Amino acid sequence: TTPTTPSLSPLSTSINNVVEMNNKSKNKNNQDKEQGYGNLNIGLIISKIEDKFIRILSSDCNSFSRGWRITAISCMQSILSIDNLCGHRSLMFLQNKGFIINMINDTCSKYLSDNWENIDPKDLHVYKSQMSLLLKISQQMDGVHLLMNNNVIGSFVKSPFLNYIPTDKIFGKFIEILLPILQLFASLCCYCNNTSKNNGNINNNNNVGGTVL
Protein backbone atom coordinates (compact mmCIF):
# COMPACT_ATOMS: atom_id res chain seq x y z
CA THR A 1 0.00 0.00 0.00
CA THR A 2 0.85 3.71 -0.48
CA PRO A 3 1.68 5.74 2.70
CA THR A 4 -1.05 7.10 4.98
CA THR A 5 -1.22 10.91 5.43
CA PRO A 6 0.89 12.45 8.28
CA SER A 7 -1.08 13.03 11.53
CA LEU A 8 -0.81 16.77 12.38
CA SER A 9 -0.04 17.42 16.11
CA PRO A 10 -1.99 20.32 17.83
CA LEU A 11 0.82 21.08 20.35
CA SER A 12 -1.26 23.60 22.46
CA THR A 13 -3.86 21.10 23.87
CA SER A 14 -2.76 20.97 27.57
CA ILE A 15 -5.99 21.48 29.66
CA ASN A 16 -8.24 18.96 31.50
CA ASN A 17 -11.00 17.94 29.06
CA VAL A 18 -12.08 14.39 29.46
CA VAL A 19 -14.34 12.47 27.10
CA GLU A 20 -12.74 11.79 23.67
CA MET A 21 -10.31 8.99 24.53
CA ASN A 22 -12.87 6.12 24.37
CA ASN A 23 -13.79 6.53 20.63
CA LYS A 24 -10.14 6.55 19.29
CA SER A 25 -9.55 2.74 19.18
CA LYS A 26 -12.72 2.07 17.09
CA ASN A 27 -11.92 3.20 13.54
CA LYS A 28 -8.20 2.19 13.64
CA ASN A 29 -9.50 -1.37 14.28
CA ASN A 30 -10.86 -1.08 10.65
CA GLN A 31 -7.90 0.34 8.61
CA ASP A 32 -5.46 -1.90 10.62
CA LYS A 33 -7.68 -4.92 9.65
CA GLU A 34 -7.93 -3.79 6.00
CA GLN A 35 -4.14 -3.29 5.49
CA GLY A 36 -3.69 -6.24 7.93
CA TYR A 37 -5.58 -8.92 5.88
CA GLY A 38 -3.57 -8.55 2.60
CA ASN A 39 -0.19 -8.57 4.43
CA LEU A 40 -1.39 -11.48 6.66
CA ASN A 41 -2.47 -13.40 3.50
CA ILE A 42 1.10 -12.96 2.07
CA GLY A 43 2.58 -13.90 5.52
CA LEU A 44 0.20 -16.95 5.75
CA ILE A 45 1.54 -18.10 2.31
CA ILE A 46 5.29 -17.52 3.03
CA SER A 47 4.99 -19.13 6.54
CA LYS A 48 3.80 -22.47 4.98
CA ILE A 49 6.67 -22.68 2.42
CA GLU A 50 9.52 -20.79 4.21
CA ASP A 51 11.86 -23.81 4.96
CA LYS A 52 11.84 -24.69 1.19
CA PHE A 53 11.39 -21.23 -0.45
CA ILE A 54 14.09 -19.34 1.58
CA ARG A 55 16.30 -22.52 1.25
CA ILE A 56 15.98 -22.50 -2.59
CA LEU A 57 16.41 -18.69 -2.76
CA SER A 58 19.50 -18.61 -0.44
CA SER A 59 21.01 -21.47 -2.52
CA ASP A 60 20.30 -19.49 -5.76
CA CYS A 61 21.75 -16.26 -4.20
CA ASN A 62 25.18 -18.08 -4.29
CA SER A 63 24.56 -20.75 -7.05
CA PHE A 64 23.40 -18.40 -9.87
CA SER A 65 25.41 -16.78 -12.67
CA ARG A 66 26.05 -12.97 -12.19
CA GLY A 67 22.84 -11.30 -13.56
CA TRP A 68 20.32 -13.75 -12.02
CA ARG A 69 22.41 -13.81 -8.75
CA ILE A 70 21.48 -10.09 -8.44
CA THR A 71 17.77 -10.94 -9.16
CA ALA A 72 17.79 -13.61 -6.38
CA ILE A 73 19.55 -11.20 -3.92
CA SER A 74 16.95 -8.45 -4.71
CA CYS A 75 14.14 -11.03 -4.25
CA MET A 76 15.70 -11.66 -0.77
CA GLN A 77 15.82 -7.84 -0.12
CA SER A 78 12.06 -7.58 -0.98
CA ILE A 79 11.18 -10.62 1.23
CA LEU A 80 13.12 -9.21 4.25
CA SER A 81 10.98 -5.99 3.97
CA ILE A 82 7.99 -8.37 4.74
CA ASP A 83 9.63 -10.99 7.10
CA ASN A 84 8.46 -8.88 10.12
CA LEU A 85 4.93 -10.29 9.30
CA CYS A 86 6.24 -13.90 9.54
CA GLY A 87 8.21 -12.90 12.72
CA HIS A 88 11.82 -12.39 11.40
CA ARG A 89 11.86 -16.08 10.32
CA SER A 90 13.62 -15.67 6.94
CA LEU A 91 16.35 -13.61 8.70
CA MET A 92 16.66 -16.30 11.45
CA PHE A 93 16.66 -19.07 8.75
CA LEU A 94 19.59 -17.34 6.94
CA GLN A 95 21.68 -17.41 10.19
CA ASN A 96 20.49 -21.04 10.77
CA LYS A 97 22.19 -21.79 7.35
CA GLY A 98 25.32 -19.58 7.92
CA PHE A 99 24.25 -17.42 4.92
CA ILE A 100 25.02 -14.08 6.67
CA ILE A 101 28.67 -14.98 7.64
CA ASN A 102 29.21 -16.81 4.30
CA MET A 103 27.98 -13.67 2.41
CA ILE A 104 30.27 -11.43 4.60
CA ASN A 105 33.26 -13.68 3.69
CA ASP A 106 32.09 -13.73 0.00
CA THR A 107 32.03 -9.87 0.18
CA CYS A 108 35.36 -9.04 1.92
CA SER A 109 37.53 -11.61 0.03
CA LYS A 110 36.26 -10.72 -3.52
CA TYR A 111 35.60 -6.94 -3.42
CA LEU A 112 37.53 -5.53 -0.35
CA SER A 113 40.88 -7.30 -1.00
CA ASP A 114 44.02 -5.76 -2.61
CA ASN A 115 42.71 -6.34 -6.19
CA TRP A 116 39.71 -3.91 -5.71
CA GLU A 117 41.12 -1.65 -8.51
CA ASN A 118 40.62 -4.64 -10.94
CA ILE A 119 36.91 -5.49 -10.07
CA ASP A 120 34.72 -6.15 -13.18
CA PRO A 121 31.94 -3.44 -13.36
CA LYS A 122 29.32 -6.21 -14.03
CA ASP A 123 30.17 -7.86 -10.67
CA LEU A 124 30.47 -4.50 -8.87
CA HIS A 125 26.61 -4.71 -9.22
CA VAL A 126 26.80 -8.12 -7.44
CA TYR A 127 28.78 -6.31 -4.67
CA LYS A 128 26.19 -3.43 -4.54
CA SER A 129 23.28 -5.92 -4.25
CA GLN A 130 25.13 -8.01 -1.56
CA MET A 131 25.77 -4.75 0.41
CA SER A 132 22.12 -3.61 -0.12
CA LEU A 133 21.04 -6.99 1.41
CA LEU A 134 23.32 -6.33 4.48
CA LEU A 135 21.78 -2.79 4.61
CA LYS A 136 18.26 -4.40 4.51
CA ILE A 137 19.27 -6.72 7.43
CA SER A 138 20.65 -3.82 9.59
CA GLN A 139 17.23 -2.09 9.13
CA GLN A 140 15.89 -4.65 11.77
CA MET A 141 16.51 -5.00 15.59
CA ASP A 142 17.38 -8.75 15.44
CA GLY A 143 19.30 -7.95 12.20
CA VAL A 144 21.72 -5.53 13.98
CA HIS A 145 22.24 -8.28 16.61
CA LEU A 146 22.80 -10.96 13.90
CA LEU A 147 25.34 -8.71 12.06
CA MET A 148 27.34 -8.21 15.34
CA ASN A 149 26.99 -12.00 16.10
CA ASN A 150 28.95 -12.42 12.77
CA ASN A 151 31.54 -9.66 13.72
CA VAL A 152 30.46 -7.45 10.72
CA ILE A 153 32.36 -4.25 11.70
CA GLY A 154 35.54 -6.15 12.70
CA SER A 155 35.32 -8.45 9.58
CA PHE A 156 35.14 -5.49 7.15
CA VAL A 157 37.78 -3.49 9.19
CA LYS A 158 40.33 -6.37 8.77
CA SER A 159 40.03 -6.16 4.91
CA PRO A 160 42.92 -4.67 2.77
CA PHE A 161 40.76 -2.03 0.92
CA LEU A 162 40.32 0.24 4.01
CA ASN A 163 44.12 0.76 4.42
CA TYR A 164 44.22 2.38 0.92
CA ILE A 165 44.86 6.15 0.51
CA PRO A 166 42.98 6.94 -2.79
CA THR A 167 44.38 9.05 -5.69
CA ASP A 168 42.60 10.96 -8.43
CA LYS A 169 42.52 8.61 -11.51
CA ILE A 170 40.45 5.92 -9.57
CA PHE A 171 38.86 8.00 -6.66
CA GLY A 172 35.26 7.44 -7.97
CA LYS A 173 35.65 3.59 -7.76
CA PHE A 174 36.94 3.98 -4.17
CA ILE A 175 33.79 6.04 -3.27
CA GLU A 176 31.54 3.41 -5.03
CA ILE A 177 32.99 0.73 -2.64
CA LEU A 178 33.43 2.84 0.57
CA LEU A 179 29.90 4.40 0.50
CA PRO A 180 27.92 1.08 1.03
CA ILE A 181 30.27 0.17 3.97
CA LEU A 182 29.67 3.57 5.65
CA GLN A 183 25.88 3.13 5.08
CA LEU A 184 26.04 -0.36 6.72
CA PHE A 185 28.17 0.92 9.68
CA ALA A 186 25.83 3.93 10.22
CA SER A 187 22.78 1.54 10.04
CA LEU A 188 24.21 -0.63 12.91
CA CYS A 189 24.02 2.43 15.27
CA CYS A 190 20.26 3.02 14.72
CA TYR A 191 18.24 0.44 16.74
CA CYS A 192 20.20 0.91 20.03
CA ASN A 193 17.63 3.35 21.60
CA ASN A 194 14.36 1.46 22.47
CA THR A 195 15.10 0.53 26.18
CA SER A 196 12.70 2.91 28.00
CA LYS A 197 9.17 1.30 28.45
CA ASN A 198 9.58 -1.30 31.24
CA ASN A 199 6.10 -0.94 32.89
CA GLY A 200 6.10 -4.15 35.06
CA ASN A 201 2.64 -5.70 34.30
CA ILE A 202 3.76 -9.21 35.50
CA ASN A 203 0.46 -11.11 35.02
CA ASN A 204 1.01 -12.89 31.60
CA ASN A 205 4.14 -15.23 31.77
CA ASN A 206 5.87 -15.11 28.28
CA ASN A 207 9.62 -16.14 27.96
CA VAL A 208 11.03 -15.50 24.46
CA GLY A 209 14.53 -14.12 25.19
CA GLY A 210 14.56 -11.54 22.37
CA THR A 211 17.81 -9.64 23.08
CA VAL A 212 16.83 -6.09 24.11
CA LEU A 213 20.21 -4.38 23.52
Binding site: S25, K26, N27, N29, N30
Partner: protein, 71 residues
Protein backbone atom coordinates in the same frame (compact mmCIF):
# COMPACT_ATOMS: atom_id res chain seq x y z
CA UNK B 1 -35.90 -10.54 2.64
CA UNK B 2 -37.98 -7.52 3.84
CA UNK B 3 -39.16 -9.51 6.93
CA UNK B 4 -35.55 -10.51 7.71
CA UNK B 5 -34.47 -6.82 7.22
CA UNK B 6 -37.27 -5.58 9.59
CA UNK B 7 -36.24 -8.30 12.11
CA UNK B 8 -32.52 -7.28 12.01
CA UNK B 9 -33.43 -3.57 12.48
CA UNK B 10 -35.95 -4.28 15.31
CA UNK B 11 -33.29 -6.39 17.15
CA UNK B 12 -30.54 -3.72 16.57
CA UNK B 13 -32.95 -1.05 17.93
CA UNK B 14 -33.59 -3.22 21.05
CA UNK B 15 -29.83 -3.79 21.69
CA UNK B 16 -28.96 -0.05 21.26
CA UNK B 17 -31.81 0.86 23.73
CA UNK B 18 -30.59 -1.68 26.36
CA UNK B 19 -26.95 -0.52 25.84
CA UNK B 20 -28.10 3.14 26.30
CA UNK B 21 -29.72 2.28 29.70
CA UNK B 22 -26.58 0.36 30.83
CA UNK B 23 -24.27 3.28 29.76
CA UNK B 24 -26.44 5.66 31.89
CA UNK B 25 -26.23 3.37 34.99
CA UNK B 26 -22.46 2.66 34.67
CA UNK B 27 -21.79 6.43 34.06
CA UNK B 28 -23.30 7.14 37.56
CA UNK B 29 -21.34 4.34 39.32
CA UNK B 30 -18.03 5.41 37.60
CA UNK B 31 -18.25 8.85 39.34
CA UNK B 32 -19.43 7.64 42.78
CA UNK B 33 -16.69 4.99 43.46
CA UNK B 34 -13.52 7.10 42.65
CA UNK B 35 -13.13 9.63 45.55
CA UNK B 36 -12.20 7.78 48.87
CA UNK B 37 -8.81 -13.35 32.73
CA UNK B 38 -10.39 -9.97 33.63
CA UNK B 39 -13.93 -10.71 32.32
CA UNK B 40 -14.45 -6.89 32.50
CA UNK B 41 -12.53 -6.93 29.17
CA UNK B 42 -15.39 -8.95 27.51
CA UNK B 43 -17.97 -6.20 28.30
CA UNK B 44 -15.48 -3.54 27.03
CA UNK B 45 -14.76 -5.52 23.79
CA UNK B 46 -18.50 -6.13 23.09
CA UNK B 47 -19.15 -2.42 23.93
CA UNK B 48 -16.60 -1.30 21.24
CA UNK B 49 -17.52 -4.04 18.71
CA UNK B 50 -21.32 -3.36 18.95
CA UNK B 51 -20.64 0.38 18.37
CA UNK B 52 -18.21 -0.28 15.44
CA UNK B 53 -20.67 -2.79 13.90
CA UNK B 54 -23.62 -0.31 14.08
CA UNK B 55 -21.41 2.41 12.53
CA UNK B 56 -20.21 0.09 9.67
CA UNK B 57 -23.84 -1.15 9.23
CA UNK B 58 -25.00 2.50 8.79
CA UNK B 59 -22.09 3.50 6.44
CA UNK B 60 -22.79 0.35 4.29
CA UNK B 61 -26.40 1.71 4.13
CA UNK B 62 -25.63 5.34 3.06
CA UNK B 63 -22.01 5.65 1.64
CA UNK B 64 -25.26 3.53 -8.80
CA UNK B 65 -26.42 1.79 -5.59
CA UNK B 66 -29.90 3.07 -4.66
CA UNK B 67 -30.04 4.25 -0.99
CA UNK B 68 -32.53 1.74 0.57
CA UNK B 69 -34.95 4.67 1.32
CA UNK B 70 -35.32 4.98 -2.54
CA UNK B 71 -35.93 1.22 -3.03
Amino acid sequence: SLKFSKSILSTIYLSIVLKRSNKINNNNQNNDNNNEINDNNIENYENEYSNNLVEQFLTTFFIDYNNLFIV
